[model samples]
Target chain A: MVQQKVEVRLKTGLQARPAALFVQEANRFTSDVFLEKDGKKVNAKSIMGLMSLAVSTGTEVTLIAQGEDEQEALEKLAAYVQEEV
Target chain B: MVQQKVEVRLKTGLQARPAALFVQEANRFTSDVFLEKDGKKVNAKSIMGLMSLAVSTGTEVTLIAQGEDEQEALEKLAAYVQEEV
Candidate 1:
């Protein structure tokens, strides 16, 4: 299990274009990925679940992954959220 | 306020009185009002639209309105979401 806390830096939206990209990145790995905010967590691979959180800019959320490629999954996904654009 | 984000504190569905009251409050103003949950943003003045959200307790949502009285509507409606009743 790999876990890390990161702030959402994307300006568009977590359920928008970048969100789709985030899911795509998560789907590339064999690990199970999830994002948690507050007491709620959702499968990062599910766009609707991710959107259900209504994530916005500067919101801090957790990235969790458990599997062989968990490390790489977290790295790539976290990088996407922490980006300036 | 053109946009304000709030968590839905109401215990019942947004279709209930609290939600109806929410729409009623929006009708009092001319601003184009919307509540965004997940990736869907719908008219705050329409009970049908609010009903579609099916908002549940502890759901964090964003209140958005653009026009005169926008800020007032936001504060009032947000109070309802943050309602203790």
Candidate 2:
């Protein structure tokens, strides 16, 4: 379970390579994580789903995860999202 | 409007840099082009969207375009999708 309120502080947001990086890392986890922004949510593990949101540098998104490794996935991914925060 | 069955003929299947190239080229047009694989669709203009497909060689996908330049968009993208064929 995830209820993480995370603010993206990336220099260029999750645009191209950054989004790919995140999605790449997301694929490593078995948990299902959804990054929700502006009331729309997507499976964080999917590059297409994540890019559909077009999140920007200062966007505030919720990282909601559910699965066997939800807690660990949230921990690591949350850190990745806020690495520059 | 453009709707057609597309096939992935690339040896690498738009994995990383290839997807980027496709997306970069797609952004030049204003048409709404979606690459649909197995009924799951994504924007062709987005790297993440394209990469999420995890498309491999020999996959038959759908290319649908709608906009002012839909015809041209499909023509060009069809070539891109089948460039290696």
Candidate 3:
């Protein structure tokens, strides 16, 4: 398992299009990826679940990846969240 | 029929959950609601359609509502787009 805490740096945060992109990226990994914010966790690949978090800019979130590509999943997804939109 | 041009002020713009919310709101009215951006128009009540636009913050869009509640629909939806996340 691999995990990393990162802040959402996109001006729009993780909503709408950004959230969709995040979910799309998460699906590319074979690892089971989840995002946790405020103690609530959701599958990173599920658009509905991701949107439920309503994460906004600057919100700190933890990316947890468990499975074959956990490390790579964590790194890539964490970087995605931290990217500026 | 009523129409209004509004800028997406929400930090998240109209993607994912915001787009879902906008679609849901558009469905509440009996009017035909459509959102246009960059000269492309899509049904405001369809999440898939809204996501297809990949709208981002600061993008200007036009909301068109045609029906009995066109005026109210246009006003509410336009306001929703302009509201901050």
Candidate 4:
């Protein structure tokens, strides 16, 4: 298992398109990816679940992955979220 | 043209399923619908554009519509967004 805490830097935070893109990235990994925000954790691969977090800009969240490719999944997702658009 | 400013009350804000559903609803009408947030506006029919707003709970946004069905479109969408699931 691997975990990292990162801030949402996107101007739009992690709702709509950003959230969809994040879910798309998570789906590429075989590892189980989850996002934790405000004490709630949800599956990273589900668009609905990801939106449930309502993550906003400047907010920090934790990314957790458990599987064969946990490290790669964590790194890729973290990078994707932090990247400026 | 018709416009209404409404607050996003969804726990998930306006991303993921809510965004998708809003886009789907916008598509149902021939009128052009747009959502404005934080001085940035986007076509409501585009999932990518809608997600870009990254609207969070309690955030207020403006919905604008122009066409024959603008009123109905605005009403339906406003109800959908305000509805808690």
Q: Which stretches of candidate 4 lie over 4 Å from their true place?
A: A1-85, B1-13
All candidates' TM-scores? 0.40, 0.38, 0.44, 0.44
Error of 1 at B72 (Å): 17
| Candidate that scores best on TM-score | 3
Lowest-scoring 10 consecutive residues by lDDT in candidate 3 chain B?
B1-10
lDDT, ranked from best to worst = 4, 3, 1, 2
State candidate 2's DockQ.
Answer: 0.02
TM-score order, best first, reads: 3, 4, 1, 2
lDDT of 2 by residue, A3-81 (tens): 1111211112244556677666656666566655677767555777765555432347666555665544555555665
> What DockQ does candidate 3 score?
0.06
DockQ of each: 0.04, 0.02, 0.06, 0.05
Ranking by DockQ: 3, 4, 1, 2
Q: Which pairs clash (backbone N, Cα, C closer than 3 Å) in model 4?
A: A16-B51, A17-B51
Evaluated against the true structure, the overall lDDT of model 3 is 0.55
Off by over 4 Å in 3: A1-11, A15-85, B1-15
Where is model 4 chain B poorest over a 10-residue stretch in terms of lDDT?
B1-10
Best by lDDT: 4
- Model 2 lDDT tens row, B1-85: 1111111111123336565666566567666665565777675557777656454324566655666656445555656655635
